[PDB]
């Protein structure tokens, strides 16, 4: 119910880049984080990366 602080977003970005390391994924990760500022669950974010819901 609280939008991510910048540190929370950085922590999720760094974890996602470890899982999804290609250059195209890096851009999609950032677009997903920007579109969903309440998401804090790494499994849920990974689902949006895996199924192209950017």
């Amino acid at each position: 119910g609280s939008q991510r602080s910048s540190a929370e977003t950085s922590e999720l970005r760094e974890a996602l880049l470890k899982i999804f390391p290609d250059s195209e994924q890096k851009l999609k990760i950032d677009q997903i984080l920007a579109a969903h500022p309440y998401m804090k669950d790494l499994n849920a974010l990974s689902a949006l990366v895996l199924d192209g819901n950017s």
């Binding site: 994924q25 804090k40 669950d41 790494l42 499994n43 990974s46 689902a47």
Partner: protein, 155 residues
């Protein structure tokens, strides 16, 4: 022996060590994870160097070598919150389940804000959502943001 060791990193910090064959299918690996950690294979999504792995292909197909490390993403289930942003700057908070229909979701919006479902258009990942589908049809996730567009209505 042709067996070999591989590691499966979960998103909870735990690393699972498995004994496998290059001829093992991804399907077999998920059964090994269930035997080891109890996680049902239907919840498992295995990833190697950024690529999602298909059940009917082998470790060999994917060039998964000894000491290779995979990541395990879990499919989430059950009740969750989603957030619905309006043009006027409101963020509505909804309690939902993956099996709720878009129709149900619009009814939950009507309960909170009085907005008629026929006036509502819901957008997720740039796509307009159609009434007879469910949240899971569109892969909508826990804490995701949807955008609510209000149609012109005569009243």
């Amino acid at each position: 022996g042709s067996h070999m060791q591989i590691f499966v990193k979960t998103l909870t910090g735990k690393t699972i060590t498995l004994e496998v064959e290059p001829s093992d299918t991804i399907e077999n690996v998920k059964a090994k994870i269930q035997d080891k950690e109890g996680i049902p294979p239907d919840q498992q999504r295995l990833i190697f160097a950024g690529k999602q792995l298909e059940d009917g292909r082998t470790l060999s197909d994917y060039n998964i070598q000894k000491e290779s490390t995979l990541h395990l993403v879990l499919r989430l289930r059950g009740g969750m919150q989603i957030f619905v942003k309006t043009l006027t700057g409101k963020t509505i908070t909804l309690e939902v389940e993956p099996s709720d229909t878009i129709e149900n979701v619009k009814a939950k919006i009507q309960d909170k804000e009085g907005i008629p479902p026929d006036q509502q258009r819901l957008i997720f990942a740039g796509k307009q959502l159609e009434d007879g589908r469910t949240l899971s049809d569109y892969n909508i996730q826990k804490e995701s943001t949807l955008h609510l567009v209000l149609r012109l209505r005569g009243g």
